[PDB]
Design a protein around this ligand. Structure first.
Ligand SMILES: [Mg+2]
Length: 123
RNA sequence: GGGGGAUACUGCCAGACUUGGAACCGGGAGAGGUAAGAGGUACUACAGGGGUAGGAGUGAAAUCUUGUAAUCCCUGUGGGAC
């Protein structure tokens, strides 16, 4: 019974995923949108997220881990705040890969009043 | 310009009257003001540990950034705004 935690940085342009142990100071598997898929336009797709979850599940099985919690985050703060579409797709692809999922937490770093939000309002 | 009559009216004279404003007390309300301090989270700087082919961004791209190990993750120490 080995427990791991997968970090999913889901954006509107990418959904990088890295898998660590409980302490988090050691990583096991990692794969971003462009790590396996060669199109930047399709790096944030749910199909790319399921491909990343599948290609991480076999490495997790090789390392000896069958269950991972999910710590999903958006960029957060002075950028995009809500989680992207790749989070639920990655977690469902992990659950369909055989890897059990327990707790899933949305841990996007939320600022109360952080630095100045870069934006153009209408543009 | 100057005389007589009137006293409502307004201006003059001396009080008063409490409603108008002014002053004080009571339990409450308020992102009211200055002064001081602490705090919240995020960000960021460097350093350390893990890990290894891209991260960022776009309508799509490229500059930019990354093999001097970035992205992501963990630890720690400072930073200024908010
Ligand atoms: Mg403009």
């Amino acid at each position: 019974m080995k427990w791991a935690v997968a970090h999913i940085k889901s954006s509107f342009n990418n959904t990088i995923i890295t898998v660590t142990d409980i302490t988090g100071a050691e990583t096991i598997a990692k794969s971003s949108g462009g790590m396996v898929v060669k199109a930047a336009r399709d790096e944030s797709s749910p199909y790319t997220a399921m491909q990343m979850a599948g290609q991480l599940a076999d490495q997790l099985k090789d390392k000896g881990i069958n269950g991972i919690h999910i710590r999903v985050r958006a960029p957060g703060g002075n950028k995009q705040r809500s989680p992207g579409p790749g989070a639920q797709a990655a977690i469902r692809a992990f659950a369909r890969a055989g890897i059990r999922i327990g707790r899933i937490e949305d841990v996007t770093p939320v600022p109360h009043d952080g630095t100045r939000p870069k934006g153009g309002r209408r543009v």
